[PDB]
Each structure stands twice: as C-alpha cells, then as structure tokens.
Amino acid sequence: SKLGAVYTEGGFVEGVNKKLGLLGDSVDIFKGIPFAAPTKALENPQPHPGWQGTLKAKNFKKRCLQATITQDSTYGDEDCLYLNIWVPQGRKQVSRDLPVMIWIYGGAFLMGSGHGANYLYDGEEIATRGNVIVVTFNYRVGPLGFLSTGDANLPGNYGLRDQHMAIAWVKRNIAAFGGDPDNITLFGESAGGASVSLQTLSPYNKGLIRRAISQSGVALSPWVIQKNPLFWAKKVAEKVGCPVGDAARMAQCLKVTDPRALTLAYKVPLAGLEYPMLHYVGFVPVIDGDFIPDDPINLYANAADIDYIAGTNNMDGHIFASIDMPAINKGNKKVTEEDFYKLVSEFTITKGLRGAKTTFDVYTESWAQDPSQENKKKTVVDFETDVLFLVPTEIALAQHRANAKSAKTYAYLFSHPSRGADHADDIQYVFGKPFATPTGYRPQDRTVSKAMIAYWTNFAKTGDPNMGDSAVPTHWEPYTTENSGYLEITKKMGSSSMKRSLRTNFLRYWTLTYLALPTVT
Ligand SMILES: [Zn+2]
Ligand SMILES: [Zn+2]
Ligand SMILES: [Zn+2]
Ligand SMILES: [Zn+2]
Ligand SMILES: [Zn+2]
C-alpha cells in the first residue's frame, strides 16, 4: 500500500508517503515532475528529455515567469513546466483505476502557481476524502503565455498548449501511479475554468478528456478571447523598442527580447481607470485557427461526449464592481444613477445609446421601490456578475446540452458566505481547507466543503455527482433545456436546494432583447 519509485516515461520518480489517521491510510505525494522541456519564449512546448536514476519529487518547483504584485519585478523562471500528484492509499493494497482530476488554476491568465496562493492547491484533502488522484501544474501566463500577432508569425495560445501537454502527459503516465487514464476530469476556476472549457472545445484533446468542471469561467466569457491581439503585441513592441512596421519583423524581434522585459512591458493600473477592468484584459487566448479553430460558440461538438459541470458564485462580480465603482465599498459615498449609466454604457458600446438605455432600464427596474443604497449596490454587483460570469455560463450550459451525445450537463450556483459568495470563494471549500486548517474555519464551513468534495469527486468517478464513494445532501438533477435546473450550494441543503431558471429574465434580456438591437458606428 505504497508506490515506492514509480516508473514514468522519463524514468523513476520518488515521492513522499504521509500516514493519515491511526488505522494505516496514507497519501503518496509527488512534487516537481517535468511534463515538458524548459520553455523558449513564445514558442510551443516540447518533450522533456529523460533522466537516469531516480528523480526525487519532494519540493514544488518554480512557477512560470510572471510579474509580482507591485508590477515592479518578476518571479518564477522559464523552466516551469512541472506537475504535482496526490495519490490516496487505503490500508490493504495500493490503489488502482482511481479517477484522475487535473486542476487548472486561474489568475486572469496573468498569474498563478501549481501550489497557488498562500498552500491553497494542496490536493491532499480532495484525494483522501474523495478517493481520487489530484494533479496540479504550472503553465505560462501573461505575455509569455499569450502574446500574439493574430496570424502565423506569432499564433499565441502558448499557455493553452502547455495545459494540453500536461493533460497528455497524465493520460499516458497516470496508470503507473494507480490512475484510470480513460477517466480524466479537468477542473479549474476563473481563468482556469475558462481554460478547462477551452480544452474541452479544442480538437487537440480528442480522446484525452472524459469530464470537465468550469468554476466561474467558460470559453464564452467576454474576458477570454482577445479579438485584437496585434494591438496589444504592438504596445509591447513599442515598450521594449521593437519595430512596429511589419508583422514578421515584429514577431522575430519579440521572440528575442528579454522575457523579463516582455513580462513587465505593460502594467494594469489599480488607481485610476478610464474604462472597466474588462477593457484591460490583454494577453489572453486567441482564435488562431489551430488550437482554437473557430469562435468557441461553434466548437461544442467537440464536447459531445465530455460530461460537464459549470457554475458560478453568487457574487462573482463583487471584486470587479468594487474596482470599476469604488463607492461599492466605502459606505460614505452614494452609488448614483449617473455612475451606473456610465458603467453600463461602457459595457454596451457597440449597441450605442439605445443599448445602454435598455440595459440601464432593466437593471434599475426595482430602484423605484426603496431606492436604498444596498439595493443600488447589489444591482451593480449583479450587473457585473451577469455579464462577466452568469450569462456566458448559461449560454455554455445550453450549448453543451444542445450538442451532447452521451454527455451529461450540470449547473450550480455557490452562495455560501464567510465574512453570498465573492469571487474565488469556492476554491477553499473545493480544496478542503476547512478540514486541512480547521481552526481558521467554522463547523458550517466544514459542512459546505464536505458536500462540494463529495459532489466533485462522485462526478469524477462516474459522471454523476450523486453516485460515487460519498453521500450528498441533495439530489443534483442534470441540466436540460426544459428543466434548466441548477443546484444552489449553501450551508443547509435539502430537496429545495435544486432550483431552476436562475435570473431568467436577465438571461432572456441579454440573449434575445439586447442582441436584437442594431450595432452602430
Ligand atoms: Zn528539466
Ligand atoms: Zn512558487
Ligand atoms: Zn532561468
Ligand atoms: Zn440623476
Ligand atoms: Zn434525477
């Protein structure tokens, strides 16, 4: 009931065994297995050679080169394509045919690490409580992951190819660790959720992926696909002195520039912003005609046989509303009708004055009755949540359902607070932190964490969140066009926790009324 040295495609790998409880359960922990060669700036990833003797996989390796919080310096390294594995172990014998869950972290495609914020992405609690293998890994972010010219000179999507190389590695190697290679589940959040979604839609992953979970992000969110990459490539070239005149000479120059200078070329200011934060998403995935062959809305046939959960947090837009409208935090300042109109008008520019007005009117319908500052502030949060997360997620749900063959579809809404649910509130419960650091959490927090892991890992095992090694508080009904049901996740769950048609008039507003209006110029 211990793996010892594991024979992988590159050679033997040695991790660490950690006993759990008194009876003799344990978990095998591997950190720092390479799945791809040290990266070359703006080039596609490539195989990692192979070692002799025994690779010791004891410590996390460096994340990929990215800007620090105060974007004055960088950390990480070009040699960052590493993954980490937790394998649970019972008392009798070594595990075999385990479901395998691969975590893709988020961070607006600008930041992140396999271990993550702090470690948050310690897979031990998912693996031991759900009885699954958890894989975490690094991929390239920022300009080094996503700089692109929009054509073959610099096709972008380097960070998405790194993700694909990790998934392919797991498929061909995870059996040696006790995993079922035909039963791989991707899950991820924010930028990671969008990436999970993009991986299911890419032809590159045919046959590799069995199921997927998108938390707070899908390939259809407006901050995912860069429609004018050449513009952002030219801002970076100017900042580092590359000649802008010609695409092919611009590409060749960019590939030779100091990767630290590429990373720090552009900075997202925090203090004073002209436009909403969405206008400043720069280095993100691109429709390249290769790894992403078309607009993601046209790719869902590739997910016909991939079971899919997608969901959002109650108040996912809160952090972005607070930045775009700082009067959301400080109760000293009123949120005014004039500020919301300005916000909304900046989100609806291609539909002009009439699209701003229709949107302002629907979202402020309820302001006549009790025009209090809490209802107004809630309205700004709901607007950002709708446009950035909820509406794209429901379009993805419907599109996945319409194209499904054998695939099941499921929707959730996470609403449990701890200070509803702000952005990335769900991660710590999904990863079992209320159990791994119990003093920092309340007993009700351990109640939500247990239920999410149970659903998530039941789904990993069978494609059905209700059926697996764990009991669940309430029956999660698959999503159909007819029932349009979602599970609402909270402290107290019973049969009423299955609801339907979340904020449906708004979904109808965005998908029928708003797009029916003429584009202007
Ligand atoms: Zn190496
Ligand atoms: Zn690190
Ligand atoms: Zn280096
Ligand atoms: Zn007014
Ligand atoms: Zn049912």
Q: The domain spanning residue 314 has which CATH number?
A: 3.40.50.1820
Q: Residue 276: how many CB atoms within 10 A of its CB?
A: 20
Distance 136 CA to ligand 2 centre (A): 13
Q: Coil, helix or strand for 189?
A: strand
Cα separation, 333 vs 341, in Å, equals 17
Nearest ligand (C-alpha, residue 62): 2
Nearest ligand (C-alpha, residue 259): 3
Q: Which domain does 430 fall in, by range? A: 1-521
Active-site pick, 164, 318, 416, 423: 423
Nearest to 225 by CA among 298, 274, 164: 298
Distance 48 CA to ligand 1 centre (A): 7
Nearest ligand (C-alpha, residue 339): 4
Tokens representing 60 are: 């996390």
Distance 119 CA to ligand 2 centre (A): 10
Q: φ and ψ at 8, to 5 degrees?
A: -105, 175
Active site includes 182? no
- Pair 15, 3: CB distance under 8 Å: yes
Distance 178 CA to ligand 2 centre (A): 27
How many domains would you assign to the chain? 1
Tokens representing 247 are: 């695409």
Active-site pick, 26, 95, 190, 470: 190
Place of tokens 């046989």: 305
Cα separation, 374 vs 354, in Å, equals 27
Active site includes 316? yes
The DSSP symbol for 64 reads B
Q: Residue 472: how many CB atoms within 10 A of its CB?
A: 18
Cα separation, 386 vs 508, in Å, equals 12
Nearest ligand (C-alpha, residue 84): 2
Cα separation, 31 vs 310, in Å, equals 29
Q: Residue 175: how many CB atoms within 10 A of its CB?
A: 15
Burial class (CB in 10 A: 0-12, 13-18, 19+), 367: middle
Q: Which residues contact 521 (CB under 8 A, 6 or more apart)?
A: none
Distance 105 CA to ligand 2 centre (A): 13
Cα separation, 205 vs 203, in Å, equals 5
